[PDB]
Amino acid sequence: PVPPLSVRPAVVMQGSARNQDDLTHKLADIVKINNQLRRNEQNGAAAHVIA
Amino acid sequence: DAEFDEGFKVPGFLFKKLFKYQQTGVRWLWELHCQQAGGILGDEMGLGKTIQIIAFLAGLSYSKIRRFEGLGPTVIVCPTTVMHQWVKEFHTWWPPFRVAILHETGSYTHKKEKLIRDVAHCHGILITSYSYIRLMQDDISRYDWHYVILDEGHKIRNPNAAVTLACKQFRTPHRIILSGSPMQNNLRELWSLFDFIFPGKLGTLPVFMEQFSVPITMGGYSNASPVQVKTAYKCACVLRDTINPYLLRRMKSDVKMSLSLPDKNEQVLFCRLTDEQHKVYQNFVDSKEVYRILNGEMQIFSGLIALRKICNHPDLFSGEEDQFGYWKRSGKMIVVESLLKIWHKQGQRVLLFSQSRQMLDILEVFLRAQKYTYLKMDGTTTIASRQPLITRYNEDTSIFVFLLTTRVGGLGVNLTGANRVVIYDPDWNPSTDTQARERAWRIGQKKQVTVYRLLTAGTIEEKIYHRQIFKQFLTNRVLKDPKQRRFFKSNDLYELFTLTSPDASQSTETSAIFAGTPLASSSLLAKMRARNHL
DNA sequence: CTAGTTGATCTCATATCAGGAGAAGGAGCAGAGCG
DNA sequence: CGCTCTGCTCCTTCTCCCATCCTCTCGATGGCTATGAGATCAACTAG
């Protein structure tokens, strides 16, 4: 379960740079590796790579 | 009427029209239909593969072989640019097939789901686009299709694309692919195509890679240990005979005597970098960005795009006689200047190809700076007006140079009136450049066509061309003959962030690399021990 | 109603040191039945 | 007569917690891959 935006608000700094929450960065890592694992299982990858 | 072994009465008044290889292809297709397996009509372009398919399906319908009294509902998934052609072909060969197109243009004028239902209810011949297979992948696959023909089935070359999954969601045993090249880059595409036509024959893609792809490429390098090359040869032989009865591929060598073919010559010009372009390239290959690429902290892809932009023209990467895209700042544009001037003095007609549309626009601005008349067609032109431009180029001579990228238009748009062709920059896929050169030099080409590939020596472009040749060699080894003289080095081929421009004292890297130029249990055992000693 | 043009929108390619305190597991083992 | 089944002790992880409230300064934080073609569709722009 990925929480809503209220639990991880993207606070705007003095300028326009929108800083993301720690939860959002972590979910970014999770989605990155999840997509990476999904393609590695779908396409050519070694068993140790998938592991 | 010609009759086959089990009884497949292909009509005489169609069968007589086919050529010998076409009749062989119909025989092969019907052998597949008896075995209830699929195949790949891997015959290269121009031989005529739609004629074989309509002839075979027409014979299967008239012969009333049976499930289904004769031929049932079949779906043909082809690119949009050829859909109407397909229906016309049916209507001229075998009229009584109720052929119907699924498209916004179409002819149904009602709900498309009703079209699928009605066509299946009449055992019709239904043509779609790959996008409609992807979008209605749940809807279109409910009406018990009897045949699935993926024309230009190399759209399935990626085992990850949603089109591949939607196309592999069909249930019939009958899967035919009409592709001019089953594989284009590497064996991922061969595996995907074979997973389509015959789900179980080649193993799961991990198994397939670990058994075939890695050993073959490891034996495709000239610094490989002898054991590696021998294993690569053996594994290539195993893949070849495994795919032998399901990939029918014929070249223009055996069938050449039947049809004419004007001679084609090809050169690879090595265009030295201009000193400003050379300085920019050296600054990029010395800047911290490529260092971070070598550290793996940044995506190498952006560096690749940047170096390709630099070799095309500095104004792409960097951003009177000093306006945007001045042709004097890139050596390839110098050579294009010379070739265009000479060819215009010769009265010939030119195709100008480039993978980048931005540098295509730069070339347009350059041509406007000159007085050459020209015509442009790219992805930005509306498709409904693509056919006129080509015709206007092909019919007259008052248009000199036609501008393309390698990947615009339907496959093999008829650009026949051109005489010379120049590929401004190489691509990663050998097949797109092969298609670029093939587009000018097709059936019904009147004059000798020559292709000039423009490279910058010692740069990223030379390595792109090396990769293109390497992939072409891999495809050839898999498809025509395993024994092959090894050209390349593993480290030199893969390291592609350096700059060693030639000084003419030493020869270029390409020329340095290409410097030379029942069984009675004993035949069975003999073949086993023969294959095992390798 | 019918094309034709024009944006949006989406898919697919090619790159390689000055804590402590308690709870739970585990291991060595003494010994008791007991077949 | 050797095996099992305890259940005692000694050690080892392992994990949890460490007063409340308030004021102020001061440093760090900034995330950008590209490009192009095919196809669908939905909105205008004429008819």
Q: Which of B493, B415, B424, B492 is nearest to B456 (CA)?
A: B424
Chain A residues at the B interface, defined by Cβ less than 8 Å, are 39, 42-47
Find which of A32, A35, A42, A43 to mutate to test the B interface (most B CBs within 10 Å of its CB). Answer: A43
Compute the nearest-CA separation of B208 from chain A (Å): 9
Burial, B420: exposed, middle or buried (Cβ in 10 Å; 0-12, 13-18, 19+)?
A: buried
Distance CA B44, CA B238 (A): 23
Amino acid (one-letter) located at A10: A
Which residue from A minimizes the CA distance to B158? A43
Measured in degrees and rounded to the nearest 5, phi and psi for residue B56 equal -65, -45
Q: How was this structure determined?
A: cryo-EM
Spatial distance from the CA of B306 to the C1' of C35 (Å): 84
Q: Which residue carries 């980048």 as its tokens? A: B356
Distance CA B464, CA B433 (A): 12
User: Closest nucleotide to residue B293 (Cα to C1')?
Assistant: C16
With an 8 Å Cβ cutoff, are B188 and A43 in contact?
Answer: yes
Distance CA B524, CA B46 (A): 40
User: Closest nucleotide to residue B429 (Cα to C1')?
Assistant: C14
Chain A residues touching residue B206 (CB < 8 angstroms): 44-47
Q: Which residues pair with B301 in a beta bridge?
A: none
Distance CA B163, CA B505 (A): 51
Q: Where are the alpha helices (DSSP H) in B220-299?
A: 226-243, 275-286, 288-295
Task: Give resolution in angstroms.
Answer: 2.8
Distance CA B166, CA B161 (A): 9
Distance CA B390, CA B262 (A): 22
Contact B94, B167 (CB under 8 A): no
Q: How many CA atoms lie within 13 A of B311 on its CB side?
A: 31
Compute the nearest-CA separation of A6 from chain B (Å): 32
Compute the nearest-CA separation of B159 from chain A (Å): 7
Spatial distance from the CA of A47 to the C1' of D11 (Å): 40
Q: DSSP string of B96-162?
A: TS-EEE-SSSSS--S-HHHHHHHHHHTT-EEEE-HHHHHHTTTTSTTS--SEEEEETGGGG--TTSH
Q: Which residues contact B42 (CB under 8 A, 6 or more apart)?
A: B177, B179, B180, B181, B182, B247, B248, B249, B479
Give CA separation, B455 vs B90, B314, B333, B358, B386, in Å: 45, 15, 11, 18, 29
Q: DSSP string of B47-114?
A: S-SHHHHHHHHHHHHHTT----SS---EEEE--HHHHHHHHHHHHHH-TTS-EEE-SSSSS--S-HHH
Which residue from B minimizes the CA distance to A50? B206
Spatial distance from the CA of B80 to the C1' of C16 (Å): 35
Contact B60, B33 (CB under 8 A): yes
Q: What does the DSSP 8-state code read for residue B324?
A: T
SS3 A13: coil
Q: Long-range contact list for B380-385, CB < 8 A, 24+ apart?
A: B383/B80, B383/B81
Q: Is the CB of B408 under 7 A from strand D?
A: yes
Nucleotides of C under 7 A from a protein CB: 2, 4-6, 11-16
Q: Which of B285, B404, B274 is nearest to B326 (CA)?
A: B274
User: Closest nucleotide to residue B463 (Cα to C1')?
Assistant: C15
Find which of B210, B211, B216 to mutate to test the A interface (most A CBs within 10 Å of its CB). Answer: B210
Task: Output the six-digit token pair for B205.
Answer: 């893609």
User: Closest nucleotide to residue B407 (Cα to C1')?
Assistant: D37
Spatial distance from the CA of B273 to the C1' of D19 (Å): 74
Compute the nearest-CA separation of A43 from chain B (Å): 7
